[PDB]
Structure formats: C-alpha cells, structure tokens
Design an enzyme around this catalytic site. Sequence first.
Site, PDB file in Angstrom:
ATOM      1  N   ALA A  65       0.856  -1.180   0.000  1.00 57.62           N
ATOM      2  CA  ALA A  65       0.000   0.000   0.000  1.00 57.62           C
ATOM      3  C   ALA A  65       0.893   1.232   0.000  1.00 57.62           C
ATOM      4  CB  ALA A  65      -0.953   0.010   1.197  1.00 57.62           C
ATOM      5  N   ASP A 102       6.427   8.645 -13.283  1.00 58.87           N
ATOM      6  CA  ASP A 102       6.525   8.224 -11.890  1.00 58.87           C
ATOM      7  C   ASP A 102       7.468   7.035 -11.753  1.00 58.87           C
ATOM      8  OD1 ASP A 102       6.174   7.999  -9.189  1.00 58.87           O
ATOM      9  OD2 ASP A 102       4.192   7.059  -9.296  1.00 58.87           O
ATOM     10  N   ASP A 105      -4.772  14.207 -12.504  1.00 54.52           N
ATOM     11  CA  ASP A 105      -5.356  15.406 -11.913  1.00 54.52           C
ATOM     12  C   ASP A 105      -5.988  15.099 -10.562  1.00 54.52           C
ATOM     13  OD1 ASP A 105      -5.036  17.895 -13.431  1.00 54.52           O
ATOM     14  OD2 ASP A 105      -5.978  16.795 -15.084  1.00 54.52           O
ATOM     15  N   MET A 110      -3.786  -6.451 -12.563  1.00 56.19           N
ATOM     16  CA  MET A 110      -2.577  -6.666 -13.341  1.00 56.19           C
ATOM     17  C   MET A 110      -1.984  -8.019 -12.977  1.00 56.19           C
ATOM     18  SD  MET A 110      -0.625  -3.517 -11.445  1.00 56.19           S
ATOM     19  CE  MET A 110      -0.883  -3.210  -9.700  1.00 56.19           C
TER      20      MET A 110
END
Lengths: 308, 275
Positions: A34, A148, A175, A101
């Site tokens: 997390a 990132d 955003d 994923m």
Amino acid sequence: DEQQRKRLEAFLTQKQKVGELKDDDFEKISELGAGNGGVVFKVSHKPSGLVMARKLIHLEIKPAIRNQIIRELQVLHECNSPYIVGFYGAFYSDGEISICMEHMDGGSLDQVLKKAGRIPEQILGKVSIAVIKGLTYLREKHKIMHRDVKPSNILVNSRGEIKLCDFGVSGQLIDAMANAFVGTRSYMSPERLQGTHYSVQSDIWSMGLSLVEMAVGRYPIPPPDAKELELMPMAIFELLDYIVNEPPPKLPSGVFSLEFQDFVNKCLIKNPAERADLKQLMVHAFIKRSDAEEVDFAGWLCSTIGLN
Amino acid sequence: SDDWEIPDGQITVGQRIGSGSFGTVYKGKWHGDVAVKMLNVTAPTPQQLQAFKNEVGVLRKTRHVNILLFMGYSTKPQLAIVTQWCEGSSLYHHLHIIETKFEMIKLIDIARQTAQGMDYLHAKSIIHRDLKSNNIFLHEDLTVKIGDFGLATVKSRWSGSHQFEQLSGSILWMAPEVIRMQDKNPYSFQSDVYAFGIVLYELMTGQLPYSNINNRDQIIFMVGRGYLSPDLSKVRSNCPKAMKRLMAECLKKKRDERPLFPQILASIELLARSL
Ligand SMILES: CC(=O)Nc1cccc(-n2c(=O)n(C3CC3)c(=O)c3c(Nc4ccc(I)cc4F)n(C)c(=O)c(C)c32)c1
Ligand SMILES: Nc1ncnc2c1ncn2[C@@H]1O[C@H](COP(=O)(O)OP(=O)(O)NP(=O)(O)O)[C@@H](O)[C@H]1O
Ligand SMILES: Nc1ncnc2c1ncn2[C@@H]1O[C@H](COP(=O)(O)OP(=O)(O)NP(=O)(O)O)[C@@H](O)[C@H]1O
Ligand SMILES: [Mg+2]
Ligand SMILES: [Mg+2]
C-alpha cells in the site's frame, strides 16, 4: 527474442479467458502493499483461476471524472511488452477504482532493496536495461511517458523479469491524484518541480535517482555524511528545494566502476536538454558492458527474498 | 476536570468510513452515533500521551454551534478519538463530488458560519492546522460544523520529547510559511486564515485551486517559493467584489498581511447585508 515471444503470447492467451471483471469474481488471498494512493491485494479470479494483483484506488471525485478515468485506463490493453507489467482489466465498484494486473512474485524493487540493503552494480545494470527498454516501448509504441519512475514502480518476478508499472496513462487520474497529502520524498526532476514534463528525459532523471538509492541503499537527498559513506529527517520542501538549487547527487568514487558512475551522472544532469536521452543511454559504456554480462538475476532475487 | 478517557467495551465500532491525514474514521456507537478516528500514532510515548491528554482537556471545553463536539478519547484497543457523528456530506462532497448548486446567498452564508466557528476557535487560542472543505460538514444542509481542529500532538509523531511538525495533510490549503516549515511554529492564526482563503476560493469558483497543475511536488515547491498562487480569475461572475477582495486578503503570501477572523467575520456579514 523467442522466450519473450512465448511468454507474451501466453499472457494474451490467459487474458482471453478473462471476461467481464466483477467484484464478486475475486477472492482475496493476501495483501501485497500500500501507499499514498491505494492498496494492492493478491487475488484469484474465480471464473478463470488466474492469480492477479488488484490495486484499489479510493478517489473522492465526481462521477463524470471517474468514468473518464476508467475509459482512459483501457489503453493499458494495448501495452503488451516484456518490460511492462501485464494488464488484465480496470473497473469501478464500491467507490474504488480497481486495476487488475499480473502478479509479480518478486515485488517492487523498493521491497527488494530493504531485503538486500544494497543492490550490486551487476544487478542494477540489468535493471537499467529493463527500465530503459520499458521507457522506450512507452515512448515509441504509445507516445506515453511514465512520469513516476521509482523503485516502488519497478517490479520483478522469480522468472528473472523486470517490468515497469504504475506509469501515467490516464490524464484525469493524474489530476485527481494531484489533491493528495504531501509525501516524504520525491524523485521528481528539477524541471518538473519548476515547470512541466520535458519528454522522456524527465523520466531518465528519476531512473538515475532510483539507481543511486538502490546502489547505496539510502535515498540520496541529501547526500550521505562523510563518515556515513565510509560506513558502507529533511523536510519535503527542503528536498524539493535541494533538487532544484543544489548540485545533483553522485555515487561514491571508490565502490562503483567508472562506467556506472558516468552513467548515473549523465542521468542526473539538472538541465533536461544536456541530460542523456534514451538513445544515448542505450549505447552507454555501462549498458554495453552490463548487456554482455551473464548475470543470474532470478537466482539473486530468490536468494535475497528467501525463496529456493 | 480531568480523566476524559473512555474505557473499553463502551464504543461499538462500526463500518469503516475512511482515512485522512492523521487517522482512520469509523462510525461507532457511544450514547448515540459518534465518529471514532483511529489515530495513526497507535504507540504513543508517555510524554506524547500526556501532551495529548492536555490538548484533549482544552478541546473538551469547546462548545459552539459551528464546531463539532469533542467527546474525549480512548486507549484500550488503540489510541483513538471520539467526536460527534455528522449526517449529510461534507463541503468537499457538495462542491467537488456531488456538485450541489447553491445560490450566492447560501454560499456566502456557508462562508459566514465557517468564519463564525473559526473566530470562536481563535478566541480560545486554538489553531486548527487542517482547515479545509473536507473538515466542514453541513449538518442538515443548513448549519456548518468544523471538525478535526487542533490535535497538534497526534499530528507529527514524536521522537521522545520533541514534536517537529512533519508537514502532513492536504497541500492545497497549506500556507506558504507552512509548506516551508522553516521558522519555529509555521502553524498560526494566519495559516488558518490562509486555509480559509482557499475555502473561499472553493466557494467562489467551484474548483480546487491550481486546476492546471497536476503535479503534487510542483505545487509544494512553487507555492512554498512564492511562485504559485490561486488564480483568482476563476471566480464566478456573480461573486461579489467585496468577497473577492476579502479572499485575496486571506491568501497573502506574507502571513503578516493576512487579517484575523474578527475582521474577516465582519467583512462577510457586511457584504451579506448589502446583497
Ligand atoms: C499528483 C500525481 O502524482 N499524479 C500521478 C502521476 C503519475 C502517476 C499517477 N498514477 C499513480 O500514482 N499510480 C499509483 C498510486 C497508485 C498508479 O497506479 C497509476 C496508474 N495505475 C497502473 C498503471 C499501469 C499498470 I500495467 C497498472 C496500473 F494499475 N495509472 C494507469 C496511471 O495512469 C497513473 C497516471 C497512475 C498519478
Ligand atoms: N502487480 C503487483 N504485483 C506485486 N506487488 C505489487 C503490484 N502492484 C503493486 N504492488 C506492491 O504494492 C506496493 C504499493 O503499491 P503502490 O500503490 O504502487 O504504492 P507505491 O508505488 O509503493 N508508492 P506510491 O506510488 O506513492 O503510492 C508496492 O510497494 C508493491 O510491492
Ligand atoms: N465526525 C465525522 N462524522 C462523519 N463523517 C466523518 C467525521 N469525521 C470524518 N468523517 C469522514 O470520514 C472520512 C475520513 O475523514 P478524515 O480522517 O477526517 O479525513 P479527511 O477529513 O478527508 N482529511 P483530515 O480531516 O485532515 O484527516 C471522510 O469521508 C470524512 O467525511
Ligand atoms: Mg506505484
Ligand atoms: Mg475530516
């Protein structure tokens, strides 16, 4: 090559066995991790028995924006490369955006770093090749850029693979993320802190900074102490200011080869134009050498974690 | 007064609501619906604990119509906070999620009550530290209730006897001097007035500030450096000029130029009459 083509075609095969993704079709196995953004569980898709990693982003956004995020996320079906984590499907249920994923049993290079303390230069060479190729596949085949890159977003598995993950594909998702609590450290390039993305070079900075951290086993901003280095809580705003107005970090002069040191140095040039691009890094001395080396990455990983 | 501690077996912790900047809220039962926030500092030091107790003592003596009641704390399972449970959605949900369509009268009234409660908190020398539309609830759609005020000792985990405020919370409402975290105590009355100014921006533009910047760390650096400021062009056309001028006064980069809440509350009431 051939083994990569086998695995890619095999993933598409298993992906076709997955139809509509519903919240009921998943059975929660174990928590994987997390962080400021969401939480990831290891799950089993009951309609197909496939084991997947399911990230749950809880955003308090207007529905119209959320629906656009889900729609934009469907681009991930087109990302099929051995350097990009496999994508099964994204949906929305119970107020959380779920993105399923492929499960990487090695984890993120962030976790591997803690289990290992430092990562050998021989290994970071392979990691650099993977990251360079991953960014390349995103730049050419999709004109999208990661935005990132950090150890937590480089995934690995027992089969020796190194794949990119959590790369920027949904504008609206970025955003909505922008309204989040402050973190503790930033891999953002200086031009992004003062301006906007400057092509793939801004990602190359983050790759370099992640390499320095993984090589020394410590976030390199600020650089280590004089005797902390022979031994081999800064404010967030002071970190961002140090990245903008202070010389970039570097590797110790005596522990790492010159090709590696020059590699990270060309990756951490503060001016984004002078900084090295993917074309330059691909044929750098350190990458040329690390590509010819026969390093057993899968064995090193399973040893660092504790698997057989 | 003294022991404001709630024992175990008295709080019926219910459905998990959500996590914020310094805790995770559950809807518990305790002589009626309450809000139980499981603090992140689950293992506190005896020095931090006693400071937390002292601050709980100051927060318990607060009673205002625009302030969420502070009912005490507990420490049996883990350190938690027990506060009045609020119906309806927060201001953030109305403005940015539900997109409720208020009239300028109701919007200015929401700004008045918020200033009303804030003026009461500063009257008792209480720095909010986390003023934002997320901590403003509209009890019954009518009255305003400010929550998550104070609690400086549970924010920024301690080392032993120090509490260096590790900047936490949402960055949109953080004043520049707070972002930098350079001079002693950045959290002041003017830092709350700035956050209030960002709330005004929310009310008068229907948007969060910096709608064209989608980089968290870019906003942190640029706002702390005085390079970035909320674009006031985004203010609605029907918004009063006096309101817009008051908003600009609250968002001054140099905190010494921001007004205090007595003056702010007066300006809001004056422009509410001349409407
Ligand atoms: C202010 C700010 O930082 N904005 C910002 C800036 C860059 C990134 C993000 N961004 C993010 O942070 N995450 C992490 C936090 C969970 C994502 O997972 C994440 C994500 N998911 C994902 C990606 C690939 C695969 I294969 C599976 C996946 F599930 N996709 C699709 C995104 O398009 C973005 C845009 C994400 C947000
Ligand atoms: N597909 C995956 N397989 C295995 N582990 C995963 C996968 N996706 C995420 N994780 C784990 O989940 C953890 C947290 O996920 P993530 O939301 O990306 O946080 P983060 O990348 O560590 N930091 P941040 O981007 O700031 O939220 C990572 O450290 C990984 O170990
Ligand atoms: N007293 C309360 N009554 C009802 N809902 C609440 C209460 N306090 C918080 N919540 C809700 O619980 C969730 C998490 O709240 P919280 O932990 O306060 O995070 P936050 O308010 O968004 N940011 P912060 O207040 O700075 O921690 C949100 O959906 C809040 O609206
Ligand atoms: Mg990630
Ligand atoms: Mg709140």
